[PDB]
Each structure stands twice: as C-alpha cells, then as structure tokens.
Design a protein around this ligand. Structure first.
Ligand SMILES: Nc1ncnc2c1ncn2[C@@H]1O[C@H](COP(=O)(O)OP(=O)(O)O)[C@@H](O)[C@H]1O
Ligand SMILES: [Mg+2]
Lengths: 145, 219, 146, 148
C-alpha cells in the first residue's frame, strides 16, 4: 500500500480561493491526524549514515574538510562533537535515528549558517584572486612601485 | 545523494515533523503551502495533494527527469516521488505495488491516477505497447464516469464506485497488460434518488442528448 | 483488448481511484456501506504500516514501543460480524418473517448492539446518550474515526 | 610574532605603494584589505573590520604601518587550504557530479557572504564556464583560482 490523500479547498471550482472550514472537514474525514501517529512513533525521524554525513559533514570539525569514512564513525563523532544527548538519537547498523524533530530543526539551522560561511570562504578567495590577477599584471610591468 | 527535502521548503513538507500537532496548525500549514502554490505534503511516505484547479509546470517531461530514480526524501514533495518509490520497489526489489487514492469528490483523485499511469508509462520506456494500455484507460475514464457517477447533495459529480486498474508487467519490464476492476456500485441510486440528488448520468445524457428518432426508437 | 491471453507469471502495480469519507446532512444505507469500506481501508492501512515500522526497527535492533491510536477493527467488526453485525442484522431483517419496518430494525440494533462501546443510539438499553438531546429518534450514531 | 624580515616587508610595500595613489605612506579603510588580498593572504571583510577596530579607539580608521605589518604577520600562514575550498564548492552541487546551476549560484553569491556585486558574479559565471549556458563547471575553475 502506497497512498494518496486528496483535499478540496473550495466549492466554487476556483484557483486562489481557500476555505479553512471545508479543508478542516476533510482533515477529519480522511483522518490525516491518525495517519501521523504510526510514523510519529518512538523515533519520529530517521536517516541513513551516508546522506547524513554528506548532509552534516560541515558541522563536525573532525570530518571537515573531508570526509570521513566510515560513515557511522563520522556520524558518531558528529553527534559527539555537537554533544546532543544520547536520549535524543539512536544508532543502528544501517540507520541513524532521531527521536524528537526539534533536533532536526536545529541541525538544519546550523547547517544553513555554515552555508553562509562557505559563501564567505568562496568570495574572499575569488576577490583576492582578482586582486592577485591585477597585482600580477601590474607587478610584471614595473621594476619598482 | 546530498540533496534533501528540507531545501526549497515552504512551511514544512511533512506533517510528521509538525510541532504542536492539531487541526489548527495543520490548517496553517496547508494554507501557507497552498497560497504559496506548493500542493504536495507528505505524512511519512504518504502523499497529500490539494487541488489547485489549474495547470502547474510540475508535470512537464523535463520535470519528470528531475524525479526519475531519485529517492523519496531527497527532493521537494510531489506525487511522482511516491510512484518512483513504488516503481523502484517493484522494479528492483520485485514487490507488487498498489496505490490507494482517497479523498473528496472534486479533490483531484482521478486526475492523480491518470498522472501515475502517465508517469509509469513514461518511465518504463516500452512505447506503443504501454501507450495502448495508457490510451485504453485514459480514453475509457469518461465512459465509466458517465455510467457509474452521479450528482449528490454536496457535489455536481461524485465517485459512487471504486475504479481499479491492474498494471501488469513481465519480469523483463515488458507490459503484459492491465485490468479495470469496478467495486461497490451504489445500486439503489438507480431505483430511488434521494432528495436534491440525481440518478446516474447516462439516463440524463440519454434523454437530453438523443435525437427524436432515437427517442422514438427506444420508446 | 489489453488483457494478456497467456497465463505467464507476471508482476503488478495497481491504482485504486475510490472516494473519501463522507458526512452528509442526511446519511442513509449507501453512506453506511461507503463509510464501512472506508473503515476497512483505514484498518488494513494502519495495520500494514504498523508492521512496516516494526520491520524497519527490528532490522536495526531498535526496540519498538506501543503508541496509542484509533482502532478501526472494533468498528469494522460492529458492521462485519455474522452474529451481531449491522449488515447481518439487516440481512436478517430482510430475511426474517413478520412486520419488517425501519423502526423494528432500529429496535433490533437497540437490542443486540447496546453493550457495544462504539454503538450510539438514544433508545439503547445501556445508553449514556439517552438524555443527549442532539440525537433524533429514527436515527443512530456510529463512532467512526472522523 | 617574531616578526617579519625586511624582504617580506619590502614585498608588502610594493602593493602598499600600488594602492597609495596619493603617495602619503598610508591608505584608508575601504582599500586596506585590497593590499592583503592582492598579496594572497586573503582575510574576510568582517575580520578586516576587527583588525581596524582592534587598534583604533577613536573610530576614524587611521592605520599606521607597523600595526599593518602586525596584521600581515597574523595572516601570513593563515591562507586556507585548496581542498577545503574545493569541498566548499562541492557542497553547492546540484546532483553530486561536479557542476552548479548558474541562476542558483548567482542567487547564493549575491545574498550570502560578503555580497559580490552585479558585475562580479556575472564575471564569475563566465570565468567558470565560457561555453555556457545556465550550468557552470568548477573543476578547472578552483585549480585556476587557488594557484599562486
Ligand atoms: N493534480 C492536479 N493538477 C491540476 N489539476 C487538477 C489536479 N487534480 C485535480 N485537478 C482538477 O480537478 C478536476 C477533476 O478532478 P478529479 O480528479 O476528477 O477529482 P475527483 O477525483 O475528486 O473527482 C480537473 O478539471 C482538474 O483540472
Ligand atoms: Mg475524479
């Protein structure tokens, strides 16, 4: 069973008109809330080790810059260096497990700021490469400035 | 693959990740995502669609190749990721699949079944032998919805029976066919309409659409 | 036209275009069958998904804990059961001789479904919805998941 | 530091005299890090404001040359690694195969970091891939920028 819910927003067959009450009726009818509970269990979220270390290798200074294999060992020292409590997550053989989703909000926030730090790390080397190009052209033109 | 669901996210793309869980914040989520014109939101591995009543360019064949054999969680929510997870669970792991599509009449179920049929007929790559089956189902849909569907109190047209479609493949991937299977015909609507409702459409199309020699022929 | 004539071994992906759950202003037997098959779909759906999660956590040697949710299998039984289910009682009322009205069927449902938790009618014998003024006579309630 | 010998100070004096267009032996704040990025040390703008605010208690940004040599002595071997820059471009990959879509990269470079201007990111797309279009490869591009 793979499964598709369909939600009707209005009765006027319009495009931009949204009604909260009709959709609320259809949330109750279809049972979206009871669909949450079976995937909302004791661990509410999970990943695999390889796109987790691909995902958060920049939050761990041991994995930075590359990479580091094995994936469970780098993910383990990732959660060790970030010192998230051991109650909040769990290790498996082939899956990492996240109990509460607020940790997943926090880690994506910190990753989102490290993207900005990577943009700074790029832009200083690019602009200094332009200044190195200009000083490289002007340096070979004169014996002394 | 490093890309995830959490990039390009308006609101939250999953109800599982929703803090405090009620009806009201979920209405906030659907109103935010629908007003920002993102109409798909998951519950675990469950698609939620909201009908926008108009065309969006997420069904272009260029957009199909964005989704093909990318994993389920790796990208923004859309109906093709479920059919890709089912198609990879069938193709690589040999597990027969079925997609149950439920919701309000007018909420976009039949169209979604058409889009899953078109997506599978695209990604199998078997040409006219799968496009004969697809053409058969797509050109057979207004027939079945003319016979077995009728007006209710709430809607102008409503699914009064379950359409089913078998999509049958070889081990090699060659299309062996498919079977429409009807379920649960509301029979007493034929003989007794409720107040404000309507009997099945083929009688009204038969009386209103025919010529006078056909009505005098059918007595 | 499109069915294979050969009996060869095959694979299948099916799609099921079927209604959602319905609440009208006036609900009758057709809506009772419609809501019943909705109860069956929710039952088999949440049950198979529960087995899927227990399989994913039994692979990784992760201890499953029980989580509380609505059980459809009490509801479906209330309609399905061959000895006191509502379809069995209406099948009996269409079969049993004598004066068969709608009132006698509702009184039979008040007789053989009183000690059920999820059955709700005003003239039920164990009723805590007797003084519930919002329940008209010649009607009854079923505690569906919606 | 210890600090610097006469050879490296006289090496710094050449770019320092290149951006001394008036011939006064000092320059202002907004052209101050252009010498350091011209000579290859490459500090950020934010820590450049930290170095200017470190020695100035007045707030006008008048910088003397021996403190300027101390700023250059703190950032002499602080140049960042090539593989770290390479991975920093590997994060912004679209599919994990060695390219970036050009419009998303133009949106990142003008909204994160020290905010490259309009002509600099349009220059960056063409320096990254002159053949075009809408998709830039960066395997040769980082090897060209990290070489001194
Ligand atoms: N995913 C979708 N994208 C675009 N339009 C849709 C979509 N789903 C439904 N519609 C619109 O809804 C109408 C029919 O929807 P349908 O699938 O018949 O709903 P239902 O199955 O609930 O009766 C069509 O005119 C179509 O334009
Ligand atoms: Mg339909």
């Amino acid at each position: 069973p793979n499964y598709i819910r369909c939600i009707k927003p209005n009765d006027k067959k319009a495009a931009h008109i949204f009604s909260e009450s009709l959709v609320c009726h259809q949330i109750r009818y279809l049972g979206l809330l009871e669909n949450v509970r079976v995937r909302r269990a004791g661990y509410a979220f999970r990943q695999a080790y390889e796109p987790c270390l691909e995902r958060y290798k920049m939050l761990c200074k041991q994995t930075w810059p590359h990479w580091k294999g094995p994936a469970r060992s780098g993910v383990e020292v990732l959660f060790n260096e970030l010192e998230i409590p051991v109650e909040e997550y769990s290790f498996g053989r082939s899956k990492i497990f996240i109990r509460n989703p607020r940790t997943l909000f926090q880690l994506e926030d910190l990753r989102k700021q490290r993207l900005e730090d990577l943009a700074t790390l790029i832009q200083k080397i690019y602009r200094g490469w332009k200044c190195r190009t200009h000083f490289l052209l002007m340096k070979g033109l004169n014996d002394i400035f | 693959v490093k890309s995830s669901l959490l990039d390009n996210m308006i609101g939250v793309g999953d109800t599982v990740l929703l803090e405090p869980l009620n009806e009201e914040t979920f209405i906030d989520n659907l109103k935010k995502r629908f007003d920002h014109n993102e109409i798909y939101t998951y519950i675990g591995s469950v698609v939620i669609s909201v009908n926008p009543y108009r065309s969006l360019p997420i069904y272009s064949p260029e957009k199909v190749e964005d989704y093909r054999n990318r994993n389920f969680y790796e990208l923004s929510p859309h109906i093709f990721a479920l059919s890709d997870e089912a198609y990879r669970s069938l193709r690589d792991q040999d597990k027969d699949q079925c997609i149950l599509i439920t919701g309000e009449s007018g909420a976009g179920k039949t169209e979604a079944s058409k889009l899953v049929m078109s997506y599978v007929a695209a990604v199998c790559g078997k040409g006219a032998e799968v496009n004969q089956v697809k053409e058969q189902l797509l050109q057979s849909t207004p027939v079945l919805e003319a016979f077995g569907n009728a007006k209710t109190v709430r809607n102008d047209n409503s699914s009064r029976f379950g359409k089913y479609m078998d999509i049958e493949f070889d081990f090699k991937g060659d299309p062996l066919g498919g079977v429409i299977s009807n379920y649960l015909l509301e029979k007493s609507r034929v003989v007794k309409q409720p107040r404000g409702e309507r009997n099945f459409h083929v009688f009204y199309q038969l009386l209103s659409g025919a010529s006078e020699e056909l009505l005098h022929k059918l007595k | 036209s499109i069915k294979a004539q050969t009996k060869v071994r095959k694979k299948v992906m099916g799609v099921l275009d079927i209604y959602g759950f319905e609440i009208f202003e006036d609900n009758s037997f057709e809506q009772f069958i419609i809501n019943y098959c909705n109860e069956k779909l929710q039952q088999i759906f949440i049950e198979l998904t529960l087995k899927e999660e227990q399989e994913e956590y039994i692979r990784e040697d992760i201890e499953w804990t029980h989580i509380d949710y609505f059980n459809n299998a009490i509801i479906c039984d209330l309609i399905e059961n061959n000895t006191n289910g509502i379809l069995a009682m209406l099948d009996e009322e269409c079969l049993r001789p004598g004066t068969v009205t709608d009132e006698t069927f509702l009184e039979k449902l008040n007789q053989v479904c009183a000690t059920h938790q999820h059955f709700e009618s005003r003239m039920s014998k164990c009723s805590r919805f007797l003084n519930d003024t919002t329940l008209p006579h010649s009607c009854f309630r079923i505690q569906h998941y919606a | 530091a210890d600090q610097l010998t006469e050879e490296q100070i006289a090496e710094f004096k050449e770019a320092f005299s290149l951006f001394d267009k008036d011939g006064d032996g000092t320059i202002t704040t907004k052209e101050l890090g252009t010498v350091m990025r011209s000579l290859g040390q490459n500090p950020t703008e934010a820590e450049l404001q930290d170095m200017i605010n470190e020695v100035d208690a007045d707030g006008n940004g008048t910088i003397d040359f021996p403190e300027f040599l101390t700023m250059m002595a703190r950032k002499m071997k602080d140049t960042d690694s090539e593989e770290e820059i390479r991975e920093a471009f590997r994060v912004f990959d679209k599919d994990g195969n060695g390219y970036i879509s050009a419009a998303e990269l133009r949106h990142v470079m003008t909204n994160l970091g020290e905010k490259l201007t309009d002509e600099e990111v349009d220059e960056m797309i063409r320096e990254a891939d002159i053949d075009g279009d809408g998709q830039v490869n960066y395997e040769e591009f980082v090897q060209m920028m990290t070489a001194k």
